Structures are given as C-alpha cells and as structure tokens.
Amino acid sequence: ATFLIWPIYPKIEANEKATAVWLQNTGKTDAMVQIRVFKWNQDGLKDNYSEQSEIIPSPPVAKIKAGEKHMLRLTKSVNLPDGKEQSYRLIVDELPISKVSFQMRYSIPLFAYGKGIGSGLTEESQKLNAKNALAKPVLQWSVRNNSELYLKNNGQKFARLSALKTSKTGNDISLGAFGYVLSNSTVKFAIDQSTAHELAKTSKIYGVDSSGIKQELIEITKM
Amino acid sequence: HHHSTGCTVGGSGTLNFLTEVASAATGGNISVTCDGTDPVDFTVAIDYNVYRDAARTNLYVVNQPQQFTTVSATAVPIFGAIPTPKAYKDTLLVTVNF
C-alpha cells in the first residue's frame, strides 16, 4: 500500500472540536485500513500508549481504492483540561486482504489543547502562546549510568529534537533513538560513553527543535 | 502562507529468495517523501533477518526504531539474508513513525 498523508503533524486547537487528516491511496491496488487514536505518555521514562475516548476518529475502518483520497475526521469529545497540551498517536494499519511480504503501520503525532495554550502554528495560537510563560518546551538534562541521557520537560509544550549541540554555533554531537520530550514528561535514552563524557565538560547544551513553525535552537539546562 | 507538511509513504514488490546450506539474499522498495522546505525525521521499526544496509551490516532489531530523515525523496532500504519463516513465507510489520 502507498499512502499520501496530510498533514503529518495534525493538531486540534482549544477553540476547535475537530480536525481532519487526509489519506490518499496513491497506489494501483485497493487497500483497507484500521484507524485508531491512542493516548501518548512518557511515564516510566519510555513511550506508552493506551485506549482513549478524548479524541475519536471517523471512520475507524475504511476501504480506500486506488487513487482515492479519504478524509479522517478527528473529533474532540469534550473540552480538555485548561492550559494543557494533550499528546496522542494516530495509527493507520494496513489490513491484509521463500517470499517475505510487507504490512505497513503508519503512526503520526497528534496534539490537542485546552484553553490558554495552542500549537503556535497559526497567528491566533501564537498570540495565545505569547501571553503564556510556559507555552513552550522547557528542558533539563542529566547523564547517569548503571550511560543514559535523561531529558526532563517542564514546559507545557512538547519538544521535537533532531540534534544536540554543546554551543549555539557549535556542531551537533555524536548520538549513535530520541526525539519527543512531551510536556511535563521526562525521557531517558542510551548514549555512547564518549557522548556522556562530552556532556560532562559543560552545563548548558542545545536542542534542534521543530515543534513550531521553523527549526530553532532551544537551551537545555543541567539538572 | 505556512506550509503544512505532507508525506507520501509507499514507496512507488517484496523479498523472494527442505532441510542446501548457503547464503541467499534479496531486496525491495519502500520510500518516504515529504514536501517541507525543511528535512523531516522519521523512524522505522520492524517487528531470517533484514538490514538497512547494502552489504548487510546494520540490523533492524526487533521492535527497535531506526533513524531516518529526508530532503525534498528518501529510500527505506530493506536487505534480506539467510547456512523466522515457515512452510516459506513470512509477514513482517513495518512501522513508520513521524
């Protein structure tokens, strides 16, 4: 199955009841998909998923013929807690309908907002976030072996990190599996020894973050 | 205006290779193509083995994410090899994470 998926970063702002994600089967063969939304949390220092009724997708199953563009509706059931960002994964499963074959699962992030906070991907939500001190990721870092890097987000917005730097104008350091540090969450992940010691010779390090409109550097404080 | 990124994930075909002890191989075709003016990271996890590597020195560990990015296409190379199929067919689950 071949799918175009748009947007790859959907969100549901506070004053919205619903958003849409488009799935077009750009293949020559029909496909069937199961569509599900899971609550997403990083407790236990690892990504967890669970059943959820805060956001309901429609339809939950769909046949999408070759060339066909289907609209997923994603409905916020009731208002979400004030000032908070809720995190989810939207999951699309291709249903099957010496040779090994392939069966795709696509998983995209989905964020929804309560009053006082927004995605910052629009003017409205930008002005909302300007008046809110914590409408942003606020990151702290710490290394500890048994070498693992811990990242704690004190902000109310997730960070999406592609790289770490020891300085604003420096180069991104080694890092031979990490990206999302959800709001009010702390994530833990493995790093090389050389990485750990390199972080040891400093106290402020920097994330390349793409949660907002543009890529931007954010500062990470030592715990 | 502000670009909303979309990705095509196909790409746009499988791997084909008793009780003759030798080393057999094969390859397939999966791509990811976004449309930002900015690279997009994505992650691939696959649940007798399979590799991101021509010359097969980089395993898809069972359920372990494997890192990727793009620029305005990108292949998700898969290279198979065999000295947990059954009959012989296997069905592998490939998860592409944005």
Numbering used by the authors:
A (entry chain A): 1 to 97, 108 to 156, 161 to 190, 193 to 239
B (entry chain B): 7 to 18, 28 to 32, 43 to 44, 46 to 73, 93 to 117, 120 to 129, 131, 135 to 138, ...
Mind quoting what the paper says about this structure?
The major class of these adhesive pili (or fimbriae) is assembled via the classical, alternative and archaic chaperone-usher (CU) pathways. The biogenesis of CU fibres requires a periplasmic chaperone and outer membrane assembly platform termed the usher. Here, we report atomic-resolution insight into the structure and biogenesis of Acinetobacter baumannii Csu and Escherichia coli ECP pili assembled via the archaic and alternative pathways, respectively, whilst also highlighting some important deviations from the classical assembly mechanism. The non-classical chaperones, unlike their classical counterparts, maintain subunits in a substantially unfolded state by utilising a register-shifted DSC and a distinct subunit C-terminal carboxylate anchor.
Archaic Csu pili mediate the formation of Acinetobacter baumannii biofilms, which contribute to high rates of nosocomial infections. This pilus is formed from four subunits, namely CsuA/B, CsuA, CsuB, and CsuE, and is assembled using the CsuC-CsuD chaperone-usher secretion machinery. To gain insight into the structure and assembly of archaic CU pili, we determined the crystal structure of a CsuC-CsuA/B pre-assembly complex, composed of His6-CsuA/B and CsuC (to avoid polymerisation). Crystals were readily obtained in spacegroup P6422 and the structure was solved using Se-SAD phasing to a resolution of 2.4 Å. The CsuC chaperone has a canonical Ig-like fold with two 7-stranded β sandwich domains (D1 and D2) oriented at ∼90° angle. Whilst the refinement statistics for the structure of the CsuC-CsuA/B complex are good, approximately 40% of the CsuA/B sequence was not evident in electron density maps, whilst another 7% has very poor electron density (Cα atom B-factors higher than 80 A2). The remaining structure of the CsuA/B subunit reveals a double β-sheet sandwich comprising strands A, B, and E (β-sheet 1) and C and F (β-sheet 2) and β-strand D, which switches between the sheets. Nevertheless, the ordered part of CsuA/B provides sufficient information to conclude that, as with classical systems this pilin has the incomplete Ig-like fold in a six-stranded β-sandwich, in which the absent 7th strand (G) leaves a large hydrophobic cleft. CsuA/B interacts predominantly with D1 of the chaperone CsuC via edge strands to form a closed “super-barrel” with a common core. Four large hydrophobic residues from the chaperone G1 strand (Val110, Phe112, Met114, Tyr116) are donated to the subunit to compensate for the missing G strand. The C-terminal carboxylate of Phe152 interacts with two highly conserved residues of CsuC.
